[PDB]
Every structure is written in structure tokens, then in C-alpha cells.
Amino acid sequence: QAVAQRAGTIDVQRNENFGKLRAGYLFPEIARRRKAHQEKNPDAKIISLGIGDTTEPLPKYIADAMAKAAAGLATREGYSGYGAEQGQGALREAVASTFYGHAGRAADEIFISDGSKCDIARIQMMFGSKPTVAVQDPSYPVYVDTSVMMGMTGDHNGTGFDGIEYMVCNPDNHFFPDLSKAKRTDIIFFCSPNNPTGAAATRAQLTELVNFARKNGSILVYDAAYALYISNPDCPKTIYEIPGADEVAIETCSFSKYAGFTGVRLGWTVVPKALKYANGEPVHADWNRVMTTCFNGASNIVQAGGLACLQPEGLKEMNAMIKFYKENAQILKTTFTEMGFSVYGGDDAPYIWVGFPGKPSWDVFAEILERCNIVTTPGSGYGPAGEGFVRASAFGSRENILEAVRRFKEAYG
Amino acid sequence: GTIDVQRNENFGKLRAGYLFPEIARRRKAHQEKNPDAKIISLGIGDTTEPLPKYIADAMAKAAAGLATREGYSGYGAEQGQGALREAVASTFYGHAGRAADEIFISDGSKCDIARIQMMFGSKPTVAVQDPSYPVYVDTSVMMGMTGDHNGTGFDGIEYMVCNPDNHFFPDLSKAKRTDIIFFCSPNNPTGAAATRAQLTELVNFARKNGSILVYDAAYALYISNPDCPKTIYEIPGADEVAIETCSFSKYAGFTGVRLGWTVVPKALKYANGEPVHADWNRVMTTCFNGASNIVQAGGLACLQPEGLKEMNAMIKFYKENAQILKTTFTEMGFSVYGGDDAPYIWVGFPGKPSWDVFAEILERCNIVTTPGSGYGPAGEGFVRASAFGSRENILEAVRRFKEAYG
């Protein structure tokens, strides 16, 4: 019949929350802008210091663990077990003892997933639309964008979204917000080291943050994805090194490509049993319900790679890879500082954060791409307080980092 | 206490934990009471047979190769590798109109259903086939799309009841209109594969009502009957109303694999014209980090000629297991459904609660099954038995069932 030759029919309205979003997500838009630039300039040899997708080859001890788990699928049955789609016990024990020995977290509070971004979306589903949110500003834009999608916010106001408390971190406050003036919210999202500024909060700063959350009765979602890169002994690698954090904080961590590991999609969350909603219900029970209902369990291939990373040879190879990326960050930082720019980060994180005052950061991004054929990311893509800066990733080969430096000195030196 | 955030009200609407973890817990408790019992699971379906080696090979080579390549960078795409999207579009939708840019590769269908529910939000009304795998009801409840539980099901859900007397297809002339309709074919747990005429009626009903149809084709690889479409897009006009979810994960029979896809046609538009594909792409790029390239290499190998030959042999094996189970029960006088187009059977145990039949089978036969009431209100009165297991264990389960019930 004619019906099948015709459009249309559908009476469901678009979710109002998606209409609030202003632009597509930052990293896909940067990849699209890079592709458009290569279409305009087919001969350009583009170096990406943008999204961070050009991670170096994975440590062989980890790759080999994953390969052997994959090949082993041909000679075993499917696994069966109550303990658990929460993640293999051996991996959750290795994560608990490697990262949370001093910090007191148990294996049964660790939940292994396929990535931190996926877990942030699932946390937001767990919170639902009612809670109010505060976000460190600038920050990786998953926190704001998932808050908007879940309906936790008002409309965009031309600078940020109404209803989000942006906790501004900048050079003048040493990248830590003024909590004596910060508004109370239900949820606080905080990252250390922060992406994009590279700032790793000090022990005294995190003690302030935990005491702020506790006084306000807020849940703190703490992103420690880049904590492997912290060098300063005064900057904790987990929020659980702070007394009282177990009653307010959920931590998210990543061993994925985002954190520097080629080919990996793996993270975890920590939800302490001590963390309880206002009427006493444990957050851990609801998180477990989300993880068993909305998720299918991280693959046993990737969990084999995570467990290998935590064995002696895996830690040795991982540490060498972290040291290589940090040396790339220092090469980029020194290049910019010798040219007279103000540069932040690169000491505790594998990227740097460069001031370009007086021009919108999206225009700077376009100018660097035009003049140097280098992709960076614009600071305004990380929220209102990101305007005036650009981030450059250290995830790349040493030859590409060195060619980028040559190109930057030629254009800007 | 020191936290003032209230629990999400929608989590208080859930009455019990999720079905599959509870079956696993029951199995473990039974084993602890009976440490010498040799328990055969025909329950969750976790005991899938070893993965076809051509797939495992591709995954191992992709993993090993991580040690000698840089991270991938590319516009085409955080939706999944182009070669795999093209292979899915050609293999599964070559006569059904779908393009590679309508395919979104993920790490599994249950994660996609939760992300779909996020995209829809709390305002839409939901109809769910009943019985069905409980992710559709439970995610609807978590997202705030429903009222409270009422003793049988949740208020605010239109249950579309499929049973033996209606040939496992609801009476659409009497079904209330909703915004979203979740339907699966073959259905888990009944095994029913909707016919071409039935799916034409479903697509017509969705189009007349202006509803979005979310169609789960996870088990369509197991369909034998040529009258039963393997994708909703075989029905003219389905591109204007339907999203399809599919799985190549352990759920669909593939040991070790966490891989699925969704189809969101470019044609599918909300009431005021906005494309659903654009919001789904926003979700998949914001709320997800892209399926591993190890598992996508497995997916691509499964669709090459040797992969398909080995996958087809695996499907044929599980279907033989399902026929062995089905024959056993029918010879004992039970009414049995499924097994012909799905790798599980659905057996009538009228007059006793299915959770009591679950307990009885586990105590008398040391066999795990799943109770039909775990799949919604119209699942009561039945038990599902999975065909995902070794031939030795299937044969031993049949021996035990004959001793107990024959």
C-alpha cells in the first residue's frame, strides 16, 4: 500500500532536556573540525594535541594478558557466578589493595565497568532529575551535559546552564574554588587532577572540599581518572585519603584510552557502604541495582588487562608509559613558557592549559589549526571559566610532540 | 547521618532486586546447603559453549596488536568502526533498507536499553510485551516513566499480554495507546517469533498511534521459520517508527563477548520534526566511550564467510539442545513453547507459583531454571529452561527431568 511509501506519523515529543543542549559534544565536534580542515587542506600533515586519541602503544604485558583471555574464549564455557557482574573478585581485590590500601575501601565497594563516562551517565540516572548539581569550572563537559540530559538543570543562559552551581577555578585562586561563597547543592562533581587545567588539589584543599560536602549534606562525585599522573606528594590520589570522605564521596576512575591506555575500555567506581541517603538507604544498594540492570558486566578480556596492569611487570610498564607522557607534557609546557605564555598543568597531568587572552578560545583553536596544522581543544568547551585558554594533550608520539613544538616556535616564537 | 540528598523515589518503586542476580544467589545458597550436588544450570543461560575460534582469533590479534599501534583517531566514528557498521548493514539489513550510518555499535543491548530510556526521559508512557525480559519494565520504573507497583505489575505500564491462547501476540484492537512500545521477537522468555502478518499489524498500530517501537531482535539469529522476519525493517513503513536493538553478546550465545548495536533510522522524527538519530548520537557520544576495537574486530570476523559458517554451526547446536529439552517435556505431557526459533523453552506448570516450581526443580533435580513470574505478570504459570549448555549437561538434565516427572 501507499502507507509504506510515505513518512510521518509520530506523536512523541522530543525530550525537552535535549533541546537545552546548545551544540554537539566537545570531542566529536573537534574530530569533525579536524576532518573538515583535512578536506580543505588535503596535503596538510595534521598533528593532533586535541582530544588525546593518539595514545602510545599499550604496555605489552597488558596487551598480552588481553590477547590470551580473548584466545581462551575458544576453549572455555561462559562464566557463571553470583560474585559478580560487579567485576572479577581478583580485580576488585587488586584495585582495593593497590589504590585504596591506606584509604580503607573494600573490594565489595568497587564496581568494575567499561569506562568512567558510561558510569557518570549511570550515576546521573541513579540520582534522577530532582537533585541540584555543582560542577568544577572548567571541567570535562560530561558532568554538565549529563546533568542537562537528566533534567537536573534549567535552560542555557548564553554563558552556562541555569541551575548549575559553577565552582570557578582559575589562576588567581590557585585553581580551587572559594567554598566560603559556594552555593549548597545536592551533588558536587570534582576532578583531581582536573581536566583541562591539570590542577591536582592539595591535601588541605581536599580536606576543605570534604568538610564542605559534609556540612552541606552533599554527595561528592570525585573523578580521579588522571591520578596516576600526580607527582606532588601533597596531592592525594584518592579522595578517600581524607577523613570523613567515605560518608559522602563516590570515586570514578579510568584505565581507558582517556587515561592513556591504547585499546582499553575499563574503569571503576567506588561506592562506600557508609554512604547513605537522607533516610538511611545505602547508595551502594541502588548503585548495585543500576549496575546489574543497566549494564552487562565488563568484558573478561579487558578485566584480564586491568589485573595484568596491577601485577609487578604491568606496574613497571605502566609507570614507564606515565613517565613518557609526563615528559611530553613538560616539553610542551617549556615551549610555551619560553615563548612568554602563561601555562598551567603538565606537572600532575598529561596535558597543559595555556592562556590566550583577548580572543575567544574557539577562534584560537581555529587559528592554531590554520597556522600550524595542530589540533588543540578550546577552553570554552570545558565550561564558562574555560574561556581564554586552550588545552594541548601530551598523548602523542615523541616525533609528533617535537614537530608540534617546531611548528609552534615558528608561528608564535 | 551527614547526607541530606533524598533517595531517588523511582528506586523505592522497585520491590526486589533484579531477577538474574537473585537466581544466581539461589543457586549459590542451594550449593552451600548441598556441597556434593552436581547442579546443572538451564537458568540464566550463562553456560554458553566455547566461542567459535575464528571470532576468538580476531579478538586476540586485535588485543595483541595494541602493543604495536597508536590509539585510533577519526571522525568515522564514535558510532563504531565503518567496516563493522557496513558489514552489519549488509548482512542483517541488505534487503531491509538500512544504511551503515543508521547503525550504532555498543558494548551490549541492556546498556543500550538504559541509554534509550535516558533519551526518552520520564514523560513518555510505555507499553511492554508481557512476559518479557525484565530490563524494559525495570528501566522504565528507574527513569520515572511509571507509577507504583500494584501487587501484580506497575501502575502506568500497558502490559501487552502474549499467551498460548492468543498465539503469543497481543490483542492490538484492545491495547491502550502509549508513546513507546517495547516488543521482542523472538520473545525472551516465550520463544515466540512473530509472523510477517503479526509484525505488519504491530507496525500499523504503532504508526496509527504515533508511537515509537523499540524492537529487540537479539535472538533473531535463531529464527528458522521463513514466515517470521529477523528484523522489523522487513515490514514496509517500520523505518518511520522503529528502533531495533541487537546483541552479539553472551546473552545471544557468544562466550566472552560484550557487543551489540542499535538501528536508529534517519527517517524517525519526533512530533515537531527533530530527528531521533541526532539525540541518539548525542547520547552515544556523551554517555558512552565507544565499543572496544577488540570486540569490534570479533564482530567483523563473525560476519566474514568463515565466521558465519562457525556461528551457524553454533546456532544449530544450541537449537538441537532446545529440541532435546522440548521433546523431553512434550513426551511427559507438558505444554511446551519455544525451542523452534529460540535457544530456550517455555514450559507450562499450571496451578503452582513459578517461584515454587523453580525451588522444586532445584531441590529435586539439582537443575536451575528461571521462573516465568520474573518476566512479568503474564509469565506466571511457566518456567523457562535455557539451551545454552554442553550436550553432556543437556542429556543429564533430560535424564533427571524424566526421573522426576516422567
Residue numbers in the entry:
A (entry chain B): 26 to 438
B (entry chain A): 33 to 438
Task: Please give me the paper's original passages concerning this structure.
The DAP/lys pathway can be divided into three parts. three steps that bypassed by the reaction catalyzed by DapL. as a pyridoxal phosphate (PLP)-dependent transferase-like fold by SCOP. enzyme, the algal enzyme is specific for L,L-DAP.
Cr-DapL is a dimer in solution. demonstrating that the enzyme DapL is dimeric in solution. The predicted mass of the dimer is 97.66 kDa. two monomers in the asymmetric unit. V-shaped monomer and comprises residues from both monomers in the dimer. residues that are contributed from the opposing monomer in the dimer. Numbering is based on the Cr-DapL structure. substrate recognition, fills the space that would be taken by the PLP cofactor. active site does not easily fit the cyclic THDPA species. strain expressing the algal enzyme is able to grow on DAP-free media.
